[PDB]
Amino acid sequence: TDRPDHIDSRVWELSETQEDWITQVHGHVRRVVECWKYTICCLISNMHPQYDVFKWQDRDTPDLYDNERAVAYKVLLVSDLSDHSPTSGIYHDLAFNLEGEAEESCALVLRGSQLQDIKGFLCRALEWVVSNNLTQEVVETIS
Amino acid sequence: DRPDHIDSRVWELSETQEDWITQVHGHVRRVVECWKYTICCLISNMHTGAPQYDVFKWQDRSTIEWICSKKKVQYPERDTPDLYDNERAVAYKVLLVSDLSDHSPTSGIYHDLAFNLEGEAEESCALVLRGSQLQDIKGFLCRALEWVVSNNLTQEVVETI
């Protein structure tokens, strides 16, 4: 249970007090998964700023917001893409595979530039998972 | 208990939204609200490619409040619109009405999207929605009208409008 290579220094340091990790089941992993999601949020908000990131700012909050088009989004991780019904009418879902693939609604909104970063970021994290065979602890966390 | 033309998820979302058992026509009213909600979903599948509409109906209260702050917009908790067009910065309410002909707006803080039992759209609702969206609505309300006629529920439904 150490900060992985693929996670950013700032991300990990910011994540520490955002949720009380020791108390939870798969607490180190749950932190890492949430760190994937924040990383995704940052990757997406490198358009110009088009997106503001609300996750882990300084209670019922979205993960980012499009300043131009005035739309809120929530980043999700899913195991089955086809089986997906919106969780919210207001915070629109941006769902992805562990492999990196994005859902129909997700690919209509995001630019290739942002997807290719995320798929790059996700396989590198999936590699880290598979290195320590943490597959079921991650798949459970997605339920 | 649910009609097959209503989706399972919509049905289970409606469960807690109002105290149906206490009402006369309570089951029929639940179904009518599901129609309105189902219609909100059928409208919001469009995109500019960012989502065109946000749906407020049957959402958590604190989320409705959060976005209206960001969009510098304000509706009473009693009268909250069903969806919001992110393109035009204008809000709507899905109404079901028997008489479309001489329809008068319900509000001045949002607009009405009025529909028939046959699925026909009110003049002003027709102006707003694309043909793509009306086919889907009228097709859904045909399947809804079938269920109504199959269970001889036509009077109850007309009365509760």
Numbering used by the authors:
A (entry chain F): 2 to 49, 55 to 64, 82 to 166
B (entry chain E): 3 to 50, 53 to 165
Text of the article:
The three largest gene segments of the Thogotoviruses, THOV, DHOV and JOSV are homologous to those of IAV and code for the heterotrimeric polymerase. In this paper we present the atomic structures of the putative PB2 cap binding and 627 domains of THOV and the putative PA N-terminal endonuclease domains of THOV and DHOV. Despite very low sequence homologies, all domains have similar folds to those of the corresponding IAV polymerase domains. However, the critical active site residues in the putative cap binding and endonuclease domains are not conserved in THOV and DHOV and, contrary to the case of IAV polymerase, neither domain shows the expected in vitro biochemical activity.
The corresponding construct (residues 1 to 169) was cloned, expressed, purified and crystallized. THOV PA-Nter comprises four principle β-strands surrounded by six α-helices. Comparison of the two independent molecules in the asymmetric unit of crystal form 1 shows that the region 72–89, including helix α3 and the following loop, is in two very distinct orientations. Interestingly, this asymmetry is also observed in crystal form 2 of THOV PA-Nter in which there are six molecules in the asymmetric unit. These are arranged as three asymmetric dimers, each similar to that observed in form 1, but for the chain in which the 72–89 element is dissociated from the body of the protein, the electron density for the element is lacking, presumably due to mobility. Interestingly, the significant difference in thermal stability behaviour of the THOV and DHOV domains correlates with the enhanced plasticity and much poorer diffracting crystals of THOV PA-Nter. For THOV and DHOV PA-Nter the putative active site is more like an extended groove and furthermore, is positively charged. Our structural and biochemical results therefore strongly suggest that THOV and DHOV PA-Nter domains neither bind divalent cations nor are active endonucleases.
